[PDB]
Symmetry: C2
Subunit: 485 residues, 2 copies
């Protein structure tokens, strides 16, 4: 549920700063980048309605001349096959493409609702093949990543290439970095969510590619801006040539980036990460090379979807011997305290939690480094109010009085069998983030160097297998409840 | 857990028929197809050990001459970059490739354990626009027929089919792009045996294999046994591998000169094949083969999105009925008199013809159900069954269940109380399903008949949709919570 957008600047809407850029209508700029021209057309008749101001440059004849022509006349040879590709009411993620001649031009076309949007830019006319196999036999998330980043750099010759992966909190972390020997190294830096805003993420989920060929160049509006059909903003998301919002363009200039590009790494209908890549000088990429990345980006999604899902399963098997023992031993004895209390079962080693607490039929029993008694009892009280299995790396944030006595009471992992329940406390960790410029709030920042922060109150993150293995026990444990009741 | 294989024919092993072809060592033929030559080499030194007999044809100099050369000498220009691609102890699913010159030759190389295996054969906006039609393909079928059509348009095959497997290792051709004139397999289930145990396992790892000429004979090696081990050579990763003669007759018996297929694999499991045949002999350029290999792995990533989504859209169609039955069940003490009410539409949730309810001794029924003394015996068996029981044919999971088929055919059972004191069940009536085999399903050798065989199996019932199976378990979580 991302925020709904304001009207644009060219329709009496407000102007942009840090506060309101969350709700910016990026998809309707009414303008494009100069490196290529752009025409719209009527869905049914094929009449050309809107043209770019620079439509006389690539085509070779003025906007006033062609503002009213029909595609049957202008593109007589393409128009027959073109319509067969783009049927009425289809998605906008469908792109037909062919090469053209003029006294060459690569042509990208798509359809949104009832309006056809054409794209025009030049074309010059075993890399990915061998690469694709190194992706297959890449033994883990990281190996994949660095092999993947390296591949894009070798193929496109960028000055920088990074594999940005997002987080649960919309932030990210550059996990892999192929770059020029000389440039600053972002590798291993978390950037805040705000750097890629709410709607941008949602637009990159549907459309898998966008770029900026020249950061300093100015935009080129349309003729007219409003779609004569609707008399309203034009949906330009599916177009490569879309005008990148000025906010981000300064963000790019403030790093020192002439040409930028990125590709969507999407898995399970959700924007998982980006392949970020920057150049120094202005750089217009041939359509062939852009398509080669678009294969590699969707390809790279299918590997993550296999490399993540597998790398947890291999960890899952490492903690199923301890699960096997605790399955049988728990189902035997009447005493629920005096079975799980025993260090033979290694009830701490299953989670690697610094402390634990056990509650069964009134008695509260503890083991490991745990807070004092009057503290614990108040911690029991809150867990009774909490609905639903509770898990957090910072208890202080989910409970204000929990930030107290941090040495022991920092992290947490709770499960219910709240009369008879389990819990695993975790000690405080002095984690040290690596932001690329700080995380508090003027405009877009000029500092992008290695900022640290030493946030206290947070603890070691629970691994996907450590979260799930606990729930597997919850199924088999509650089944042994009836032997008492 | 597939069957372990016999030794080959060229090492004193037994010969092949229908009975024993399940345990055939297809991966070690010790021979290849003539359309391209094949050389092995030492992993460390790069010395050439084994050569094909026809290695003098493409290369241009005899086997006796080069049987003992080193790759530093033979391929001086490739050898440096080649080793960097294939590090020691890597997987065999890694293929380096470059183009060559001779007084042209595409070169495919891979590494298994400690032996390098080279492959040699000639070389002379389609996939781009296609790839997008895959994205906006609205469903499993639309995807399929668009996908099959694409391969046919791209390769110009006489036939192209999207074979999808089943839980029972059978399949069903669900899409078919073909020449106007050829017999239509579209919609035909073939039995599991047609693609055997190990073959499926070998197509999981290696995503492509072919046959460029069905009638042509194989070309052995020189020597057959790997001088390193003195043992069979692993040729699975090679495109040029000799297709086992059994299948080659199976292909001839349909009337297929050139065949090819690509693995559609999802979640580490062989989901389906893109089957494609030609009439005349057909050696495909390596470029075109690679284009399919993109499209096949690509097509895997779309199924993994199109299946997983198309169930979620169905799941939402039966969560209003779930929402009502969540609240109404948690209210009343009477478990019978709440779920008995036709207001809750407890039949409409599953669309089951009949149901039965058991709670605290009382057995209550609704819908077309079998007579009382029958039901009571059906209760007895469910108490013996461990674990949630589901089957489209109860007769197969319970011999006395095949009786009284009109009502007692299909089944879907769930437990609330541990054991079977308080539990649910949904019976389903018998369905006269009509299969479309491409030649019959009983057991000489490989069959000559591939026409449209039907069977009218009685005892089976409508299959439970993935959402209908899961929605019932979602209720089981929320229902048992109202037991206390
Ligand atoms: C308050 C407004 C802000 C501005 C908004 C903004 N930014 C984008 C597009 C991107 N921002 C990105 C952030 C990064 N750039 C990097 O180089 C790295 C890491 C090395 C990060 C984390 C990225 C990657 C993009 C995508 C575009 C691209 O890669 O070239 C938009 C949407 C632009 C559009 O296409 O419509 C907006 C509105 N940026 C801010 O940080 C805040 C202050
Ligand atoms: C007793 C042994 C038998 C033999 C088993 C067998 N099958 C294969 C490989 C394949 N079999 C296939 C069967 C089909 N081809 C189709 O076109 C359709 C449906 C339209 C089916 C069900 C297919 C597709 C393959 C993959 C190769 C291909 O044809 O593209 C092998 C292994 C051969 C090899 O790769 O070396 C073996 C041993 N087939 C039988 O039917 C039984 C008699």
């Amino acid at each position: 549920d991302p925020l709904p957008f304001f009207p644009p600047l060219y329709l009496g809407g407000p102007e942009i700063t840090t506060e309101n850029c969350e709700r910016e209508p990026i998809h309707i700029p009414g303008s494009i980048q100069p490196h290529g021209a752009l025409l719209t057309a009527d869905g049914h008749s094929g009449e050309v309605l809107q043209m770019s101001l620079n439509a006389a440059t690539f085509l070779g004849q003025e906007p006033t001349v062609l503002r009213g022509q029909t595609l049957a006349a202008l593109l007589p040879e393409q128009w027959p096959a073109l319509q067969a590709a783009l049927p009425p009411g289809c998605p906008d993620a469908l792109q037909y493409r062919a090469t053209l001649d003029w006294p060459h031009l690569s042509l990208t076309v798509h359809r949104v609702g009832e309006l056809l949007i054409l794209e025009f830019e030049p074309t010059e006319a075993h890399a990915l093949r061998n690469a694709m196999f190194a992706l297959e036999s890449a033994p883990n998330l990281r190996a994949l990543a660095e092999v993947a980043t390296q591949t894009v750099r070798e193929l496109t010759g960028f000055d920088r290439v990074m594999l940005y992966k997002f987080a649960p909190d919309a932030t990210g972390e550059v996990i892999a970095e192929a770059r020029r020997e000389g440039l600053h190294a972002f590798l291993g830096h978390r950037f805040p969510a705000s750097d890629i805003p709410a709607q941008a993420r949602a637009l990159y989920t549907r459309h898998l590619l966008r770029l900026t060929a020249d950061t300093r160049a100015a935009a080129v509006p349309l003729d007219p801006v409003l779609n004569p059909q609707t008399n309203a903003p034009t949906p330009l998301g599916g177009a490569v040539l879309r005008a990148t919002s000025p906010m981000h363009m300064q963000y790019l200039r403030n790093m020192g980036v002439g040409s930028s590009l990125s590709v969507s790494v999407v898995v399970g209908g959700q924007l998982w990460g980006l392949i970020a890549c920057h150049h120094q000088t202005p750089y217009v990429l041939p359509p062939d090379l852009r398509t080669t990345l678009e294969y590699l980006g969707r390809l790279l999604s299918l590997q993550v979807q296999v490399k993540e899902a597998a790398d947890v399963a291999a960890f899952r098997q490492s903690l199923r011997e301890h699960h096997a023992r605790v399955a049988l031993a728990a189902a035997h004895s009447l005493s629920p305290h005096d079975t799980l209390s025993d260090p033979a079962l290694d009830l701490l080693g299953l989670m690697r939690a610094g402390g634990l607490i056990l509650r069964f039929e009134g008695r509260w029993q503890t083991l490991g480094e745990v807070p004092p008694a009057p503290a614990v009892d108040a911690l029991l009280a809150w867990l009774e109010t909490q609905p639903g299995l509770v898990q957090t790396d910072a208890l202080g944030q989910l409970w204000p009085a929990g930030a107290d006595l941090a040495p022991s009471a920092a992290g947490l992992l709770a499960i219910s069998v709240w009369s008879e329940c389990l819990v695993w406390l975790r000690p405080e960790l002095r984690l040290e983030v690596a932001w690329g410029g700080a995380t508090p709030d003027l405009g877009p920042r000029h500092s992008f160097d290695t900022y640290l922060e030493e946030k206290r109150g947070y603890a070691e993150p629970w691994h996907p297998g450590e979260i799930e293995e606990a729930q597997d026990l919850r199924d088999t444990l509650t089944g042994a409840l009836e032997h008492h009741h």
